[PDB]
């Protein structure tokens, strides 16, 4: 016995046509005058666009005239002027209407791609439907003689037919004529007779229009909307506050264009009303009616036909539709220039004093009034406005464990916004931890970040348990660590290794920590010698715990002292015995996988501190003598120019092909470039001589530059090769290469010519960067738009099938193995063992248990693994079938947000993708995801049969192959162009290659298989990331491909109507509920269909979600026609409405409310 | 034929949606702001089938359409005008005479006059 | 720049200033991607309603802050209520029914 | 000055949808601030003001709290005068004004309303 | 637990549910009957609840059950007024 | 508001029918005035300082 009539919680929103009476329901009065505000009193006119009696009062609680002022009469209307004295926000929510004389056609339901009023009526849009309502050619409204039912007549034909019969087939013209047409139309009887006629002896020569319209008519009739509402007779009015005319600075009002529109339509409508009472000349009245049509259409949606101008502005007027067709500012926020903060931890950030003071204003107020100090709220305001010492301490209390989340401009992935504990800093710049300085892709060139203050309690906990930096150790894209130490610190730890012979060395042994005392007290060096010490190692096995292991290993001073930082566990020493390069991150990774979060975090802070400190102690610099040039430079250059000289002489005397000597001489200079490069590196690498004991030995150069290169720290081979070696082949604006490479280098002088040559490379480099940077996000938007609705649900379903994972082997003819693509993956079922037993069924491949997949030798290189591609889930993703790859080490928590994180991880490295039988680059990625047919698609054998020619060029034609065997034939079409690969008589299998060219994903999915096409997409999209050298897990690719294969096509006979291509969601859930419902014969078999990202994203349940990205004027219209309703499970549509997101911290709420909406 | 064959055969699929192409390969008076939206609506989005929904739908201005019906001149001369005006006065006269026939119109005018003199 | 609470535009009740304070920072699509990725439902909730353009919400939650209660008590943003009125201003009708 | 006021009526005038800074993308009507609304700070101070007064009239007597409350008209809508209060309390005019002043005398030490003043 | 917060997820899986329950308890502390179990040590209610969850006390079923007892305490102990009202409209 | 009417009644009314809109140096910045200037309307009482 509920049935509440108030503004409570809603479970869904409904969209449909509006009856004239439906408009009257919103009407709080009727606009009747084009008047807005008074010319002198500046007061709302009587019945104008800004009435007070109709809409709302100007001032809050005082009426128009002034008979009533204060809260005494908040429910009673005024005597002199019926002005309901409530609020002024009432003026913002009140509707109102205008009631037109002659009917008017709604511009949307009239001319919006398909003519809704036309297709519903079966009548040409801009041809007939225009000429019959623009007062030109009269139309018929049903005749029982000579004339049909919807034919078009001229005035002459009208009077002729009227004379022949008349007074029994009367049919007007114009708007009301189309009204009587739609009104007379019987949706029910037509829905029957159309079904009858459009099924009688007709092949595929008609079925198109038949199925189309019948589905459309059935939809409209079942929608509930009456076709009468299509053209309106009562036009509603927008609230005044949503289109106000507010006085700016010193007069000069500011109004909305809608006021001009409504004023025009009101004027034209009034004249029409007046003409329908005075003398009524047909030309005059009909013209004014067409003008009313103009005004109404211009108000609803300009678009579209010339665009009504006026308003002095040469620009058009922003109609209603243009205000809803196509960035959320927020309080408690700020931004500033960022700065490095070495003394910070990983969970801390430097927040400026004055900045944090203004940010936590309301918190300071509350805490002040709570303790004492400030007698009242305004006292607190005055107390903080006059920064009075004690207030700062109170601030030190409010920001204590109150997380503040930071954000950078280009937010590519989840790690764009990370939370920190605010640390007050005497300054006006925002300091950041140098470890998470890579996740933001932030530099200190002058980049500036923004800060947000989690106000809500659960918002603070969300920031601490999710967005906190300490929880984001690993990258969501690849399992590898993301807060890994960078340039400065890594060069430091690289210097803390680097075993140098002798030089204050000798093997004076001690025990770990004591070595520190040895280092500070000089005497001994630091990079010697090697030297031996006692290392107390710790290891665990089987029953965990800890097992000591004291020994005597030969490390160095640096390794000895550095060992102190290493946590309890770990293999110890051997992780330090190496150096500082990539194992610097490997060490962090292993530490995380064998210890945990906290030990890894503190280890990260320690290694950062260590790196910085010892790097500072080192004092590595970059003098001009650090980049030593090879002596053989001029030699190699002369030799190369000698060879090219001979080639040019040969070209002079004919001999060699002069047409392509350009290429081979380029090979000469290219070889020479590699010669200079190899010479420079082999020199600058080792060098040195030292003098160990009895002198004479060789190590590796301590040449600063090399130290930077052999330890990450921004220093690559190519860059160094340009510094001391030579800048190789340079590009030319033509796209060609110049046959005179930059012989000189930056260490040397650079001639004006070759610099004017290199300027092209720099120009196109920056330009191309500017393109791919925006193009990357341009792809990301499509990825998110298509994927941001699926979330891991229903815990862990059954099913065992899944793509057989195998090491990506180009080693067929080039040798290149990668076998780490299986880890944190849930096993399909006991994937065998050269003997028996071993692997369990649903056992997720651990990080230590994937290392067990090496104890089964190189024999086992194939494992079946559950993936998101398969998974017999319905509207989500099985937790098992997904994996675990997060910043978290465990499996994904039930109700995460796989879609967005997948899209982000894919489109994040897009910044470093070079756009162009190998396209390659971001464009290649786009084409693979869009699933576009190649420029020269190959062909496959649909059914295994016997290959034979089917009439040599007898069409038409063009060759024909016919693989026939067992039963029934097939006739494929070969267009002569491009050869073949299978002679006549030979047999083929189900999906064999008979064109040896580019494969089409549609054909692969349609014939080869889903596992094959998904394997193709992932292994082809990865191959373009291999070249760019960007690590990205296959899980996410499989994730987007999952809903990339969302819909299918049914071919048989079931409750679903055959030709309709529907998603396997409704398909599977309905076929599961039909085998055991009444009969399996009341349902058909479906067929998976490959559709691109855009084509897939285009289709979606919610009309609001669609109204977001795709064309709003279309989606909103068509969704209006059929009584559709969003209810209401998507992310995006649940975001713009401003409620809890059906994922993460939500989900539980949605599940409860979802089950709650089962009672009715 | 012309429009259909040209549009379909050319746009396959014109790659970058080359708009500035077929809009010149169309008849009638050009440079309109009306026919524009009817081409940007078909090309993409509902591909393949939309290109079959275009022709079947393909199988303008207030003032220009106003001068059209005004085109029916039926102009007059001094003779014509005086003629029409004469018919006006004739009709009016017959109406007023028909009012004179009505006695209650006279007596009502009499009653309302006494109301006028009674102030 | 930093802003606790300031002025708002007449059209859309969104933060803006330059007359005494500074117009608040802009969130956006790039950021709501991240918040959805994390699962910060309440963080996005507030960042989309009370923290921005929820007329009564901002005031109610501000009072709850000075009283040291936090919580939220959100509501339908005017940046969607306006959308209702604008769509309803056309011949099309949208209603938010209960259950 | 008549001409001066005349020129303040000219022009439509300007529409909000006018581009200004040419940002992404600017609109004149987007810079127009709302003034009919009150600052959340101001609303909070007003509420705390109600509580403050509601707690200050507690340290008074009935024949003094009611007097000040009814005279200056608070928590009762319609405010009354010396006569309408002097009739409901027998003693008329000067007597009730005496008490009305005595309450104001009482408010010369507390700081709550003092700081709420500004 | 001012740096994970990871130890709490072990006691109750799904970091999201962790946030919900922890916010629930933190709400109980910030407004209403405070009474923490783990010593404060100058920590916000945000973290105090997390410290408890890590400690092993105060979970989801725990709060729900204690809420049941809370209702059985407010209702059953003050039923005299409710019954006296029950005889109001017969 | 009644409470505010009482409040000023307790500390002195002086409820002037005027507001306030004086040009103030924005919070944060601080410096020295080097030059003042006043452009008066053509037909307005010139100021003492002007
Ligand atoms: Mg930069
Ligand atoms: Zn009134
Ligand atoms: Zn599954």
Swiss-Prot record, chain A:
Changing residue 673 to D: Resistant to antibiotics salinamide A and B. Its cofactor is Mg(2+); Zn(2+). Changing residue 765 to A/C: Resistant to antibiotics salinamide A and B. It comes from the Bacteria. SMART domains: RPOLA_N. InterPro entries: DNA-dir_RpoC_beta_prime (IPR045867), DNA-dir_RpoC_beta_prime_bact (IPR012754), RNA_pol_asu (IPR000722), RNA_pol_N (IPR006592), RNA_pol_Rpb1_1 (IPR007080), RNA_pol_Rpb1_3 (IPR007066), RNA_pol_Rpb1_3_sf (IPR042102), RNA_pol_Rpb1_4 (IPR007083). It catalyses: RNA(n) + a ribonucleoside 5'-triphosphate = RNA(n+1) + diphosphate. Its EC number is 2.7.7.6. DNA-dependent RNA polymerase (RNAP) catalyzes the transcription of DNA into RNA using the four ribonucleoside triphosphates as substrates. This is DNA-directed RNA polymerase subunit beta'. It comes from Escherichia coli (strain K12).
Swiss-Prot record, chain C:
Co-administration of salinamide and rifampicin or salinamide and myxopyronin suppresses the emergence of resistance to both antibiotics. Acetylated on several lysine residues in the presence of glucose. It comes from the Bacteria. DNA-dependent RNA polymerase (RNAP) catalyzes the transcription of DNA into RNA using the four ribonucleoside triphosphates as substrates. Belongs to the RNA polymerase beta chain family. The RNAP catalytic core consists of 2 alpha, 1 beta, 1 beta' and 1 omega subunit. When a sigma factor is associated with the core the holoenzyme is formed, which can initiate transcription. The rRNA transcription and antitermination complex (rrnTAC) consists of RNAP, NusA, NusB, NusE (rpsJ), NusG, SubB, ribosomal protein S4, DNA and precursor rRNA; S4 is more flexible than other subunits. In pull-down experiments interacts with CedA. (Microbial infection) Interacts (via flap domain) with Escherichia phage lambda antitermination protein Q; this interaction renders bacterial RNAP resistant to transcription pausing and allows it to read through termination signals. This is DNA-directed RNA polymerase subunit beta. The gene is rpoB. The chain holds residues 1244 to 1342 of 1342 of the full protein.
Swiss-Prot record, chain D:
Residues 56-109 are annotated as: Sigma-70 factor domain-4. It comes from the Bacteria. Residues 82-101 bind DNA. The record marks 71 as: Interaction with anti-sigma factors. Belongs to the sigma-70 factor family. RpoD/SigA subfamily. Contains 4 domains, connected by flexible linkers. In the active conformation, the domains are in an extended conformation, each making extensive interactions with the RNA polymerase catalytic core. In the autoinhibited state, sigma-70 factor domain-1 packs closely together with sigma-70 factor domains-2 and -4, contrary to the extended conformation that is seen when the protein is part of the RNA polymerase holoenzyme. Interacts transiently with the RNA polymerase catalytic core formed by RpoA, RpoB, RpoC and RpoZ (2 alpha, 1 beta, 1 beta' and 1 omega subunit) to form the RNA polymerase holoenzyme that can initiate transcription. Identified in a complex containing RpoD, the RNA polymerase subunits RpoA, RpoB and RpoZ, CRP and DNA. Interacts with Rsd; this prevents interaction with the RNA polymerase catalytic core and with promoter DNA, and as a consequence, promotes transcription from promoters that require alternative sigma factors. (Microbial infection) Interacts with Escherichia phage lambda antitermination protein Q. This is RNA polymerase sigma factor RpoD. The lineage of its organism: Bacteria, Pseudomonadati, Pseudomonadota, Gammaproteobacteria, Enterobacterales. The gene is rpoD. The chain holds residues 492 to 609 of 613 of the full protein.
From Swiss-Prot, chain E:
GO terms for biological process: bacterial-type flagellum assembly; bacterial-type flagellum-dependent cell motility; cell motility; cellular response to cell envelope stress; DNA-templated transcription initiation; intracellular iron ion homeostasis; nitrate assimilation; protein-containing complex assembly. It catalyses: RNA(n) + a ribonucleoside 5'-triphosphate = RNA(n+1) + diphosphate. Keywords: DNA-directed RNA polymerase, Nucleotidyltransferase, Transcription, Transferase. Its EC number is 2.7.7.6. GO terms for cellular component: cytosol; cytosolic DNA-directed RNA polymerase complex; RNA polymerase complex; transcription elongation factor complex. InterPro entries: DNA-dir_RNA_pol_omega, Pol_omega/Rpo6/RPB6, RPB6/omega-like_sf. Promotes RNA polymerase (RNAP) assembly. Latches the N- and C-terminal regions of the beta' subunit thereby facilitating its interaction with the beta and alpha subunits. This is DNA-directed RNA polymerase subunit omega. The lineage of its organism: Bacteria, Pseudomonadati, Pseudomonadota, Gammaproteobacteria, Enterobacterales.
């Amino acid at each position: 016995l509920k049935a509440q009539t108030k503004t409570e919680e809603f479970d869904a929103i409904k969209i449909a046509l509006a009856s004239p009476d439906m408009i009257r329901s919103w009407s709080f009065g009727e606009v009747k005058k084009p008047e807005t505000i008074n010319y002198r009193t500046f007061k709302p006119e009587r019945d104008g666009l800004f009435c007070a009696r109709i809409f709302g009062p100007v001032k809050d609680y005082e009426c128009l005239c002034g008979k009533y002022k204060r809260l005494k009469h908040r429910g009673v209307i005024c005597e002199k002027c019926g002005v309901e004295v409530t609020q002024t926000k009432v003026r913002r929510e009140r509707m109102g209407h205008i009631e037109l004389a002659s009917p008017t056609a709604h511009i949307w339901f009239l001319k919006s791609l398909p003519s809704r009023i036309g297709l519903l009526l079966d009548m040409p849009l801009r041809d007939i439907e225009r000429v019959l309502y623009f007062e030109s050619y009269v139309v018929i409204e049903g005749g029982m003689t000579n004339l049909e039912r919807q034919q078009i007549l001229t005035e002459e034909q009208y009077l002729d037919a009227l004379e022949e019969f008349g007074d029994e087939f009367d049919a007007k013209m114009g708007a009301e004529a189309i009204q009587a047409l739609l009104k007379s139309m019987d949706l029910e009887q037509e829905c029957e007779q159309l079904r009858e006629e459009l099924n009688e002896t007709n092949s595929e020569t008609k079925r198109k229009k038949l199925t189309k319209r019948i589905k459309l008519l059935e939809a409209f009739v079942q929608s509930g909307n009456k076709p009468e509402w299509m053209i309106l007779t009562v036009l509603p009015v927008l609230p005044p506050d949503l289109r106000p005319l507010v006085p700016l600075d010193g007069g000069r009002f500011a109004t909305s264009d809608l006021n001009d529109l409504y004023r025009r339509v009101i004027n034209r409508n009034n004249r029409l009303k007046r003409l329908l009472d005075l003398a009524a000349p047909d030309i005059i009245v009909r013209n004014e009616k067409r003008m009313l049509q103009e005004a109404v259409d211009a108000l609803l949606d300009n678009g579209r036909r010339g665009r009504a101008i006026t308003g002095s502005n040469k620009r058009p007027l922003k109609s209603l539709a243009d205000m809803i067709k196509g960035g959320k500012r927020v309080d408690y926020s700020g931004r500033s220039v960022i700065t490095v903060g070495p003394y910070l931890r990983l969970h801390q950030c430097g927040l400026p004093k004055k900045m944090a003071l203004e940010l936590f204003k309301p918190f300071i107020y509350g805490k002040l009034e709570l303790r004492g100090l400030a007698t009242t709220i305004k006292a607190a305001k005055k107390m903080v406005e006059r920064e009075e010492a004690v207030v700062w301490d109170i601030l030190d209390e409010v920001i204590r464990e109150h997380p503040v989340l930071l954000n950078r401009a280009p937010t590519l992935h989840r790690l764009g916004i990370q939370a920190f504990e605010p640390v007050l800093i005497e300054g006006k710049a925002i300091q950041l931890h140098p470890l998470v300085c890579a996740a933001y892709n932030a530099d200190f060139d002058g980049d500036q970040m923004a800060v947000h203050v989690p106000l809500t309690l659960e918002a603070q906990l969300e920031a601490r348990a999710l967005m906190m930096s300490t929880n984001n150790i690993l990258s969501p894209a690849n399992g590898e660590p993301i807060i890994v130490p960078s340039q400065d610190v890594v060069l430091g730890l690289y210097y803390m290794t680097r075993d140098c012979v002798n030089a204050k060395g000798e093997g004076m042994v001690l025990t770990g920590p004591k070595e520190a005392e040895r280092l500070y007290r000089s005497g001994l060096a630091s990079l010697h010698a090697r030297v031996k010490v006692r290392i107390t190692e710790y290891e665990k096995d089987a029953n965990g715990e800890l097992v000591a292991k004291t020994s005597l290993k030969d490390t160095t001073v640096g390794r000895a002292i550095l060992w102190m930082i290493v946590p309890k566990g770990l293999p110890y020493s051997i992780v330090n015995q190496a150096l500082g390069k990539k194992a610097i991150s490997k060490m962090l990774n292993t530490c995380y996988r064998i210890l945990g979060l906290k030990p890894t975090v503190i280890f990260a802070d320690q290694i950062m501190y260590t790196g910085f400190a010892y790097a500072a102690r080192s004092g590595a610099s970059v003098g001009i003598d650090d980049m030593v040039i090879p002596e053989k430079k001029h030699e190699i250059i002369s030799e190369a120019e000698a060879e090219v000289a001979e080639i040019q002489e040969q070209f002079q005397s004919g001999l060699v092909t002069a047409g392509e000597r350009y290429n081979k001489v380029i090979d000469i200079w290219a070889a020479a470039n590699d010669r200079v490069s190899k010479a420079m590196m082999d020199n600058l690498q080792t060098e040195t001589v030292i003098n160990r004991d009895g002198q004479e030995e060789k190590q590796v150069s301590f040449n600063s530059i090399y130290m930077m290169a052999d330890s990450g720290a921004r220093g690559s081979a190519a860059q160094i090769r340009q510094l001391a070696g030579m800048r190789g082949l340079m590009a030319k604006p033509d796209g060609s290469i110049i046959e005179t490479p930059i012989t000189a280098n930056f260490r040397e002088g650079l001639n004006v010519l070759q610099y004017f040559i290199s300027t092209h490379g720099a120009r196109k480099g920056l330009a191309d960067t500017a393109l791919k940077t925006a193009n990357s996000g341009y792809l990301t938007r499509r990825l998110v738009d298509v994927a941001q609705d699926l979330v891991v649900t229903e815990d862990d379903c059954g099913t065992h099938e899944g793509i057989m994972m195998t090491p990506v082997i180009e080693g067929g003819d080039v040798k290149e193995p990668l076998r780490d693509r299986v880890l944190g993956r849930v096993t399909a079922e006991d994937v065998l063992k050269p003997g028996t037993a071993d692997i369990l069924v649903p056992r997720n491949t651990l990080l230590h248990e994937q290392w067990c997949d090496l104890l089964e030798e190189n024999s086992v290189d194939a494992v079946k693994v559950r993936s998101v591609v398969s998974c017999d889930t319905d509207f989500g993703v099985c937790a098992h079938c997904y994996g675990r790859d997060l910043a978290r080490g465990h499996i994904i928590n039930k109700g995460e947000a796989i879609g967005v994180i997948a899209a982000q991880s894919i489109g994040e490295p897009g910044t470093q993708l070079t756009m162009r039988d190998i396209t390659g680059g971001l464009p290649r990625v786009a084409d693979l995801f869009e699933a576009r047919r190649p420029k020269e698609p190959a062909i496959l054998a649909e059914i295994s049969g016997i290959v034979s020619f089917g009439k040599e060029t007898k069409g038409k034609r063009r060759l024909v192959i016919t693989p026939v065997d067992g039963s029934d034939p097939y006739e494929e079409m070969i267009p002569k162009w491009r050869q073949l690969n299978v002679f006549e008589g030979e047999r083929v299998e189900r999906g064999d290659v008979i064109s040896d060219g580019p494969e089409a994903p549609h054909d692969i999915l349609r014939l080869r298989g889903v596992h094959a096409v998904t394997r193709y997409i992932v292994n082809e999209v990865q191959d373009v990331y291999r070249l760019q050298g960007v690590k990205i897990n296959d899980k996410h690719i499989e994730v987007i491909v999952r809903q990339m294969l969302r819909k299918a096509t049914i071919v048989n006979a079931g409750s679903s109507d055959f030709l309709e291509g529907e998603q396997v969601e409704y398909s599977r859930v309905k076929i599961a509920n039909r085998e055991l419902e009444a009969n399996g014969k009341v349902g058909a078999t479906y067929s998976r269909d490959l559709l691109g990202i855009t084509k897939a994203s285009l289709a979606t349940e919610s009309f609001i979600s669609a109204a977001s990205f795709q064309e709003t004027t279309r989606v909103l219209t068509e969704a209006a026609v059929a009584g559709k309703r969003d209810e209401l499970r998507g992310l995006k549509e649940n975001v713009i409405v401003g409620r809890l997101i059906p994922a993460g911290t939500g989900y539980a709420y949605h599940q409860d409310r979802m089950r709650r909406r089962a009672a009715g | 034929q012309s429009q259909l064959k040209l549009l379909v055969t050319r746009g396959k699929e014109q790659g970058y949606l080359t708009y500035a192409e077929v809009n010149d390969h169309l008849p009638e008076d050009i440079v309109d702001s009306d026919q524009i939206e009817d081409i940007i609506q078909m090309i993409n989005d509902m591909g393949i089938q939309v290109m079959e929904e275009a022709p079947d739908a393909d199988d303008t201005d207030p003032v220009r359409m106003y001068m059209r019906e005004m085109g029916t001149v039926e102009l007059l001369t001094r003779e014509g005008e005086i003629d029409i005006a004469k018919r006006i006065e004739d009709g009016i006269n017959q109406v007023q005479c028909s009012v004179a026939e009505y006695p209650e119109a006279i007596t009502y005018l009499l009653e309302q006059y006494d109301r006028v003199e009674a102030e | 720049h930093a802003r606790s609470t300031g002025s708002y535009s007449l059209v859309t009740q969104q933060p803006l200033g330059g007359k005494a304070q500074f117009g608040g920072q802009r969130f956006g699509e790039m950021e709501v991607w991240a918040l959805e990725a994390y699962g910060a439902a309440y963080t996005l909730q507030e960042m989309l309603t009370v923290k921005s353009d929820d007329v009564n919400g901002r005031t109610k939650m501000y009072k709850n802050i000075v009283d040291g209660n936090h919580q939220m008590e959100p509501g339908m943003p005017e940046s969607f209520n306006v959308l209702l009125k604008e769509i309803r201003s056309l011949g099309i009708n949208i209603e938010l029914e209960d259950e | 000055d008549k001409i001066r006021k005349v020129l303040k009526i000219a022009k439509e005038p300007i529409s909000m949808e006018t581009p200004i800074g040419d940002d992404e993308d600017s609109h004149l009507g987007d810079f127009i601030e709302d003034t009919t609304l009150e600052l959340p700070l101001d609303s909070a101070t007003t509420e705390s003001l109600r509580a403050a007064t509601h707690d200050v009239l507690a340290g008074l007597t009935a024949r003094e709290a009611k007097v000040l409350r009814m005279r200056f008209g608070i928590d009762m809508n319609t405010d009354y005068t010396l006569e309408e209060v002097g009739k409901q309390f027998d003693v008329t005019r000067e007597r009730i004004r005496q008490i009305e002043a005595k309450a104001l005398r009482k408010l010369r030490h507390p700081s709550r309303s003092e700081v709420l003043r500004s | 637990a001012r740096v994970t917060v990871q130890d709490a997820v072990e006691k109750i899986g799904n970091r999201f549910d962790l946030v919900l329950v922890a916010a629930r308890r933190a709400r109980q502390m910030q407004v209403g009957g405070k009474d923490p179990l783990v010593p404060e040590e100058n920590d916000k209610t945000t973290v105090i609840a997390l410290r408890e969850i890590e400690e092993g006390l105060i979970n989801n079923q725990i709060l729900d059950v204690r809420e049941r007892q809370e209702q059985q305490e407010q209702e059953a102990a003050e039923l005299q007024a409710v019954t006296a009202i029950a005889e109001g409209r017969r | 508001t009644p409470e505010e009417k009482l409040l000023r009644a307790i500390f002195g009314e002086k409820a002037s029918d005027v507001k306030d809109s004086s040009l103030r140096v924005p919070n944060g910045v601080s410096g020295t005035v080097i030059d003042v200037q006043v452009f008066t309307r053509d037909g307005v009482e010139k100021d003492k300082r002007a």
